């Protein structure tokens, strides 16, 4: 049994950095541009069950914007990631969730995520503002950070358990 998890967000919000935190428990603050799609898998070890998660790390670049709907096709789970230190990244966050439920049905487990909660320098979005739009649509919510590793596992734990299995 395999599980698909798509990672979506604006250019440099922290999609790839969260994968490195969970994959090899480490953080690199140097920016590396994502070119289209990167594939990566890991096996989550939980007390009840244990199955592998195929990760899809998509690009936040506009050049690659027209391909994003294609990356969502047949995706079991979608993980929307937005920076909280920037308003624009948080701005169209909804446009993403909409496209998800537009390509995929309603069975697709979606979860909103506000990354970069490590530094409060220039933070323009609050937990409340994210909680509200996460409550409007049938979508989970959780605060996260890649530099600090603020419960990055929680992001995975509950999203991988909240889904049918073998």
């Amino acid at each position: 049994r395999k599980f698909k998890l798509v990672f979506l967000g604006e250019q440099s919000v922290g999609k790839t950095s969260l994968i490195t935190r969970f994959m090899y428990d480490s953080f690199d603050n140097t920016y590396q541009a994502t070119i289209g799609i990167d594939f990566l898998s890991k096996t989550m070890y939980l007390e009840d069950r244990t199955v592998r998660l195929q990760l899809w790390d998509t690009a936040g670049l506009e050049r690659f914007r027209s391909l994003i709907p294609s990356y969502i096709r047949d995706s079991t789970v979608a993980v929307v990631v937005y920076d909280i230190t920037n308003v624009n990244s948080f701005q169209q966050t909804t446009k993403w969730i909409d496209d998800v439920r537009t390509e995929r049905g309603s069975d697709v487990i979606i979860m909103l995520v506000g990354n970069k909660t490590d530094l409060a320098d220039k933070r323009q979005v609050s937990i409340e503002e994210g909680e509200r739009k996460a409550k409007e649509l049938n979508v989970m919510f959780i605060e996260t950070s890649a530099k600090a590793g603020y419960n990055v596992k929680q992001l995975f734990r509950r999203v991988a358990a909240a889904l049918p299995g073998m």
């Binding site: 541009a33 070119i35 289209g36 799609i37 990167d38 594939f39 670049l61 050049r63 690659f64 027209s66 391909l67 709907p69 294609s70 990356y71």
Partner: protein
């Protein structure tokens, strides 16, 4: 010899290798090209793109030669193409859109005399698809005839290995986010048909256009002779040596007749082989008395963005 099921695991390594390779090359060519589109005022990067495609093609050959009943052909990509082609032979303001089909673009390569090797045909086919932004699509479609891939490839093959094949296609999808002219810029002497479409401002004002119009299309590799358009013809497809990226278009008339006043909104020229469509904004009169009284005007073309994504 001392390898019953050991080779099975040895082939899974090769398959992994081909995928990691594909990704790397895909990821590089995109960076090399996006970087070229960053600062270029005129090449050095142009010759690099030729070798990059050189490598992309060999990679594709190796992928297509992995685990199969080798044809006499030198190209495994062209042989699997040829088959899909021969097996379809058995089973038997806006202009009209072009037919999108791996077979179509095959035919385009098939009628290029200078190309003699099966390898060149494939190499030609892949560049044309890259310019058209259909390498991924065409391969995903060539691979849809599962019975065909099954009849040619062993079970441990790359192509037959559907979990790695899907990533393989998903990576070629990146070439759609960049503009390649690798077909147009290398085959500078082939005949290419340009579909012309004159869009007159339809509004009842004045009288019927009576003059004789002429047109002249010009691109980077050359330009057309002066084309004399038949009265009451606003759409025609003209064939001539590859003009490269269309740059400008000039239209006019001989001022003959009673009402020699023409108002053309835009001219649209399209490469019938690549599908590239250029818009040539006009919006001004053509005739003595109107505007600045010009009887011929020069139009600067714009490449229209590829559509759709359906």
């Amino acid at each position: 010899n001392l390898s019953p099921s050991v080779i099975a695991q040895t082939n899974w390594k090769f398959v992994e290798g081909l995928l990691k390779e594909c990704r790397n090359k895909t990821k590089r060519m995109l960076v090399e090209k996006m970087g070229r589109e960053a600062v270029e005022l005129g090449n050095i990067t142009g010759v690099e793109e030729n070798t990059l495609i050189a490598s992309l093609c060999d990679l594709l050959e190796r992928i297509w030669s992995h685990g199969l009943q080798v044809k006499q052909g030198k190209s495994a990509l062209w042989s699997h193409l040829l088959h899909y082609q021969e097996n379809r032979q058995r089973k038997l303001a806006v202009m009209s859109p072009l037919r999108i089909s791996l077979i179509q673009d095959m035919r385009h390569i098939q009628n290029i005399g200078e190309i003699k090797t099966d390898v060149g045909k494939a190499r030609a086919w892949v560049r044309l698809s890259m310019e058209k932004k259909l390498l991924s699509r065409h391969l995903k479609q060539l691979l849809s005839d599962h019975e065909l891939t099954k009849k040619l490839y062993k079970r441990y093959a790359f192509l037959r290995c559907d979990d790695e094949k899907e990533q393989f296609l998903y990576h070629l999808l990146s070439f759609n986010a960049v503009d390649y002219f690798c077909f147009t810029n290398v085959f500078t002497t082939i005949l290419i048909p340009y579909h012309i479409l004159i869009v007159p401002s339809k509004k009842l004002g004045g009288s019927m256009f009576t003059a004789n119009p002429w047109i002249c299309i010009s691109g980077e590799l050359g330009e057309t002779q002066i084309l004399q358009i038949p009265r009451n013809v606003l759409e025609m497809t003209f064939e001539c040596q590859n003009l490269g990226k269309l740059t400008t278009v000039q239209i006019g008339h001989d001022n003959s007749g009673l009402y020699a006043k023409w108002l053309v909104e835009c001219v649209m020229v399209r490469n019938e082989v690549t599908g590239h469509t250029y818009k040539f904004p006009c919006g001004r009169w053509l005739g003595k008395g109107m505007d600045d009284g010009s009887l011929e005007r020069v139009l600067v073309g714009e490449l229209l963005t590829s559509l759709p994504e359906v």
